[PDB]
Amino acid sequence: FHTSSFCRGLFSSLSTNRSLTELDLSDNTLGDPGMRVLCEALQHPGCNIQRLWLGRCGLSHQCCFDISSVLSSSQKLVELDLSDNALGDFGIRLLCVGLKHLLCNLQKLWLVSCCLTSACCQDLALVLSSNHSLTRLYIGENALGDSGVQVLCEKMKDPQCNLQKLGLVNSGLTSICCSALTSVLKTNQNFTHLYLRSNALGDTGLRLLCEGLLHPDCKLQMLELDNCSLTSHSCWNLSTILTHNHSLRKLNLGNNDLGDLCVVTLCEVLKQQGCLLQSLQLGEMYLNRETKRALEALQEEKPELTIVFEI
C-alpha cells in the first residue's frame, strides 16, 4: 500500500520457507518487474507454494514469460489466478508454452477479464491436448466470440480431454457456437459444469443446447443461463430437458422473460418423480399469483427442489 528491492528482500526468504502453500497478492500494484522478481523467487526448489492468486496485480504480457518459466520449472503449483490483468492474446501465447510443458501440474486457471480476443483461443486449444491436469478453466468476460468458442470446442470434443468446468461469462456469444457446445456435450464425458450468462444465445441457442442435452451420454451437472435474453418459444425444449436429462442437477434462469405459462409448465414437469433436479433459480422477474401458488405447492410436496423464485 503506497518495489523491486522490496520484492527481492521479502521473497528471498519465501523460497526457503518449507511450510507456505497459499500466497495471496490480489489488488497489489506490485508491477511487472516485481512480478518478475517473484518469479525468480518461486522457481527455487525449496518453495512449496501450491497456490498463487494475482488478481488485479497490474501485470502485462511481460510477466507471462516469467510465469511460463515458473510453470515449466515448478511441479508443486496447483491453481493460478490472473484475473483482470491485460495479458492479451500475446500473453496467452506466451503462457501456453509453459502450460503445454509435460511438467505443468496446473488444475485451476482463472483468466477472467484478461483483455483477450479469439486469436488466443487456438493456442488454448492445444493446452487441452497437451496438459491433462487442467481440470477447470474460467475464460469469461472476454471478447472471445463465436469464432474463438468454436475453435476451442472443435478441438475440445475429444473424450480424452479432461476439462470439467469451463466458463464463458459475458463472452458476447450467440447461437452460432451452440452447435459446437452441443458437440462437446454429446462427446465429452467429464464436462460437468458450464456457464453462459450475459450471452445473447436466444431460444434458438437454447434449442441447440437441448440438441446435445438430450443425448444419453450427457454428463452436464449444471448449466447457467442467467441474463441470456431468452424467451418462451423454446420452452418445450426446457420441458424436454427436464423430462429426459437424468444427470443435470442445477440450473439458472435469472433475467429471462419466460412467461407464466412457461413457469407453470416447468412446475408440472417437475411434479413427477422422474426428474432428479436438485436446484433451480428464477430470480428477478414479475410472475403471477397463480404462479406463486404453483411454486409454493411444488416446494411443499417435494422440499428437496430448492427454488430462488423470489426476487
- The contact set with a second copy (CB under 8 A) reads 61-62, 65, 90, 93-94
Helix, strand, or coil here: 181? helix
Whole-number minimum distance, CB 54 to a second copy, in Å?
A: 19
Closer to a second copy by Cβ: residue 88 or 202: 88
Question: Which regions of 57-205 does DSSP assign to beta strands (E)?
Answer: 79-81, 108-110, 136-138
State the CB neighbour count (10 A cutoff) for residue 288: 13
In the chain, what is the straight-line distance between the N-terminal and C-terminal CA atoms, in Å?
A: 39
Task: For the CB of residue 90, give the shortest distance to a second copy in the complex, in Å.
Answer: 5
Cell of 294: 404453483
Q: Output 96 or 282, the one with its CB closest to a second copy.
A: 96
- Secondary structure (3-state) at 201: coil
Task: Give the CA distances from residue 222 to residues 76, 219, 251, 293, in Å, rounded to whole numbers and listed in that order.
Answer: 30, 9, 6, 26
Looking at beta carbons only, is 96 or 166 nearer to a second copy?
Answer: 96
Query: Closest distance between a second copy and the C-beta of residue 13, in Å?
Result: 25
Which of residues 60 and 130 has its CB atom nearest to a second copy in the complex? 60
Point out which residues pair with 117 in neighbouring strands.
143
> Could you give the CA distance from residue 93 to residue 111 in angstroms, rounded to a whole number?
13
Q: Which is nearer to a second copy, 116 or 251 (CB)?
A: 116
CB of 307 to a second copy, least distance (A): 50
Q: How far is the CB of 33 from a second copy (least distance, A)?
A: 9
Are residues 294 and 265 in contact, defined by beta-carbon separation less than 8 angstroms? no
